[PDB]
Amino acid sequence: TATGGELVIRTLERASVDVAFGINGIHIDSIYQAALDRSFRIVDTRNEMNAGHAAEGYARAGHRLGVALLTAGGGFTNAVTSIANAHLDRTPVLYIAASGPLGVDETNTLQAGIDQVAIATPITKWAHRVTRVELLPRLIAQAIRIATHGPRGPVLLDIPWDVLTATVDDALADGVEELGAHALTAALGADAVERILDGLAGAERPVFIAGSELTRGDGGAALRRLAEITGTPLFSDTEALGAIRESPLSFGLLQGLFGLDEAERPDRVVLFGLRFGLATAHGSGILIPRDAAVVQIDSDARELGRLQPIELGAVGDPAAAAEELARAALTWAAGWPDRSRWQERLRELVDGRFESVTAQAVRDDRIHPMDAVTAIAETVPAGSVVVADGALTYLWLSETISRAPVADYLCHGYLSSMGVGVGTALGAQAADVTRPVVLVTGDGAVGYSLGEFDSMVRAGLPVVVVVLNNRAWGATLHAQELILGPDRVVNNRLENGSYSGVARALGADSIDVSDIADLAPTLREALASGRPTCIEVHVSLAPVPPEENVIM
Amino acid sequence: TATGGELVIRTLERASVDVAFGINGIHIDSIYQAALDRSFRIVDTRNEMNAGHAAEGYARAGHRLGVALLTAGGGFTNAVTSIANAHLDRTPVLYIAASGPLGVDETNTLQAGIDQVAIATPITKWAHRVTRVELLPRLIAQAIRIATHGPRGPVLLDIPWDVLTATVDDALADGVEELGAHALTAALGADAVERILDGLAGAERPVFIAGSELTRGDGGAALRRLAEITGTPLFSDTEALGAIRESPLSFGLLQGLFGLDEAERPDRVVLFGLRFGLATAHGSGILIPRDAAVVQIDSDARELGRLQPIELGAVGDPAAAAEELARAALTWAAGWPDRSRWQERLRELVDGRFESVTAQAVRDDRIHPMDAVTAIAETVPAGSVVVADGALTYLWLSETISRAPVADYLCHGYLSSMGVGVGTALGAQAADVTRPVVLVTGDGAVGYSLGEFDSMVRAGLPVVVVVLNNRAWGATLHAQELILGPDRVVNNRLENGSYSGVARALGADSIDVSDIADLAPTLREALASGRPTCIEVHVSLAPVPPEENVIM
Ligand SMILES: Cc1ncc(C[n+]2csc(CCOP(=O)(O)OP(=O)(O)O)c2C)c(N)n1
Ligand SMILES: Cc1ncc(C[n+]2csc(CCOP(=O)(O)OP(=O)(O)O)c2C)c(N)n1
Ligand SMILES: [Mg+2]
Numbered sequence A, B: 001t002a003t004g005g006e007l008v009i010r011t012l013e014r015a016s017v018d019v020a021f022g023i024n025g026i027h028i029d030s031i032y033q034a035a036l037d038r039s040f041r042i043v044d045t046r047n048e049m050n051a052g053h054a055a056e057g058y059a060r061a062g063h064r065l066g067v068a069l070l071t072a073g074g075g076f077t078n079a080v081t082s083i084a085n086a087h088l089d090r091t092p093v094l095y096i097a098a099s100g101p102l103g104v105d106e107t108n109t110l111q112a113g114i115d116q117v118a119i120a121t122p123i124t125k126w127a128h129r130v131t132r133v134e135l136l137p138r139l140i141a142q143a144i145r146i147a148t149h150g151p152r153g154p155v156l157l158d159i160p161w162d163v164l165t166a167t168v169d170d171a172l173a174d175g176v177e178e179l180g181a182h183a184l185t186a187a188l189g190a191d192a193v194e195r196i197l198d199g200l201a202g203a204e205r206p207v208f209i210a211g212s213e214l215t216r217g218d219g220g221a222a223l224r225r226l227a228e229i230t231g232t233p234l235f236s237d238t239e240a241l242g243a244i245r246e247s248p249l250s251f252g253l254l255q256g257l258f259g260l261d262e263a264e265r266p267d268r269v270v271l272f273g274l275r276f277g278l279a280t281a282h283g284s285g286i287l288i289p290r291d292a293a294v295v296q297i298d299s300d301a302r303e304l305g306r307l308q309p310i311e312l313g314a315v316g317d318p319a320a321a322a323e324e325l326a327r328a329a330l331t332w333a334a335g336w337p338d339r340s341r342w343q344e345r346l347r348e349l350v351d352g353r354f355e356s357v358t359a360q361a362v363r364d365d366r367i368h369p370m371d372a373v374t375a376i377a378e379t380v381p382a383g384s385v386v387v388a389d390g391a392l393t394y395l396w397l398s399e400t401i402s403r404a405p406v407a408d409y410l411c412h413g414y415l416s417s418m419g420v421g422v423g424t425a426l427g428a429q430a431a432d433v434t435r436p437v438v439l440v441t442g443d444g445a446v447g448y449s450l451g452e453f454d455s456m457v458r459a460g461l462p463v464v465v466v467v468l469n470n471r472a473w474g475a476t477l478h479a480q481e482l483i484l485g486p487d488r489v490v491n492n493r494l495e496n497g498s499y500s501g502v503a504r505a506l507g508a509d510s511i512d513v514s515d516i517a518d519l520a521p522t523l524r525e526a527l528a529s530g531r532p533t534c535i536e537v538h539v540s541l542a543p544v545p546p547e548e549n550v551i552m
């Protein structure tokens, strides 16, 4: 005899998940009861929105499946921003949402009468309602297989209250559904491996660029090895920075490719799990030349050649491909040409840009954001997770993050949803409570999730939230003031409030920083203290980050 | 020459809307620019979720259309809880959401690549994308006509960025689309009027019960007149309480009908815009007898007779029906029998229950919630808007609210989404900044929206937020402890944090109350001060509200 909720927890244990995020409710309580009996950890939040974002950050920093538990009705709809974000970011998250009882379908009853499946269908890989309790293990397994294979993404399983409370025979609870233990991701074949390596061997100025899919499959070690065997410079979007950072061949974020002379532009570019899109400057060719030979490895054929021509596309798992390529490159009969001059030209370009951005900063009476994000980048411990939110804030941080020794940099995806950072950081912290998690966020974004300071305190999750306070919704203010004029700024000033005060009232440690020389020492004491912390930094609004310009 | 955004503001002015709620973004800025040129007021919030809830509260307290402005991507998905809530509550809200530019469709670009129409379709009356700028006035008008007619409900208009920035000839901007000025809602015919009045004239123990649709059409005055002409006792769900409260025939919330002897139960019940559902105890018959003659006036035929048999259903606008009935009842040839004994039996039943609930309270060292909600009900000024959130909190308040002289009581609908109250109150306040708005909310619910204290301060919206702090997600804790035992409570204690401290840091006035004798005086000084205020009340967790029992 086992309840539906017991069947959920048992199947999740078999998938090696040991934490889920949610807010309790009567519709979903049989899962909470089962979890208590099996010592399965559920971390509560102050908004289901951040239970979802926590599931994402846990998945992104933990390189694993995240799980969010949502009660019926508003517990589901509050998570929809997180589902959409996981959808565009290709993040493997299983959302388990309870529903109204089928036995009282269409009775205008509590938290019921909304088609949660239909709401989530456009932003999930699969969304499905379980209508009988005996299906639960089989259907959960199917959901887990879909979310954790490429392109990874979110799955919603909607479970009616009276399916969760129904019971099944122990033999039905027993037995194993395929979760992924026996599953092998697609590789590259030997002919493809030989052709890709041969193109790489013929290039004058090649470059590798990694994206989220390589990170999700733990292909960092194999891609770094392949770059090191072949001497190929390694770049990445923000989601794969942690995967390339350790390599002496890492040059950081691919935005640093901007600005080479026309005769020095890369002639060959091999993409591992990176789509054409916002991070590549679309198909404009200013990072990845349109006339380069582009080789694209991705899990979805719709992405191949999407915005610019490719010489070769391969549909398959970028991590598995990096491993096959690394093995064949080690025994490559001709060996690999010396690429040290090309590597050095790239080092100059990327170091030159950092030195210029820092030197060109015009400082006023407040902390310059470049100073603040340099201080933070140069202070975090090796192995830290850095999470970024706000807009001017993350554009500034993007100029220095490539130098930080991060295990993972968790920044905005295409959804670019101001406000996701606090719940993202909280979940990343839960993937390893001993690993530092530093959230760099703006004063606008942080106001979405102030209540989660209480969640961090009660769960023992010692995130350090650094607020860059420019008293404004900053990038949107900039758009009006720079395009249309100072008289055209409207609905963007935020000249009120103390975020450190808010964090203090919620039990977190808190400090204001007005002088740049206090910032790094305060961040160090925050990391040493083992406690959730808010550091409010009073930064200047006027400076325009370089990535804002190249978009202008 | 007019932009799309100008076309939006002009059409909204013609619909007599003068406030909208949103967070600025570059995709939606042409509306913000137009609004600045025309002195159209946009109130900014700290979460689009509360821009939506503010649009709802503005609509519910203002008896008008609410408007929420959402930027592309996450600005849209953060509002989905508000759309769902407006859908189940039948609240007329127009959500205008910007989208990615059509000219860069499918380029993996900023805040784009999500089908916002498809997400909202299951929770709106209409959801549609405007693909050419010249359609905007005509399509906005159509959306406004749908949202403001019965059953009222939310509408989503999705506008691509490059449609909002495109321009149209002034003559196209000029010209009038049908907004509702020339529209007449359906009445009852004379034969229906005569039959309904005749059934009412033959009953021994009749009762009227009003719901949201009567309130939305401003049928309160006509329904009160009809009850007064005929001597019919008037009850209502929480959304129509403000509409019946002024009448000497008002007996308050229909939950007060529980408990009559079998020989005294109502034999005839006329519903005005009230569905069978959570508020009627479904079709259980414990408020509306299954063997009563039920007459149901509602705007949607799916609601007629949904859970219990009806003697007569009429599909039409409950407010317009109340007016036709009132006029015919005034000239009713036979006159109306004396119903004073039945009225008095109802007074005893409703007053008796209040006296019993108050007397049976077992007080410990903390404030009893019944004491707190009685103190608040007996203190608010005549004409106040009271908003309710949290769960134990609103169940307790439901025992005393029928006595308060409220203009409107804005409580949970079927979605029962803990957390909606702060943004709801903020929008209700904006419908008339001189009218008191008191939010009674639990410590759990209030943590969704702490950042909106800053929104109230910057907009000049002096909501008084009263937090009943029992250190817990309270009703869910109760469910575990009362059904399963104290050892089965899990993920529900909230023993951390000072909500008054949070409100103070965000610029609001704030006070803690631990002794019941400080509560009413503190509430009075809060209302007299004209400033946003948080009053944190330390209440006991143990007491079980009566409406929790009748559900148990
Ligand atoms: C959910 C959501 N709402 C609105 C926007 C529009 N937007 C883009 S940048 C920005 C300003 C954010 O300000 P802040 O968090 O303080 O960061 P800053 O630019 O000031 O560093 C806004 C509102 C968005 N991208 N996402
Ligand atoms: C959005 C949402 N999440 C979760 C729930 C489940 N739920 C019902 S009552 C309750 C407790 C709310 O506690 P609080 O706001 O402090 O009010 P109290 O009962 O303590 O007065 C919860 C979490 C819900 N109804 N809606
Ligand atoms: Mg800012």
Ligand SMILES: [Mg+2]
Pocket (backbone or CB within 6 Å): B390, B442, B443, B444, B468, B469, B470, B471, B472, B473, B474
């Ligand atoms: Mg509570």
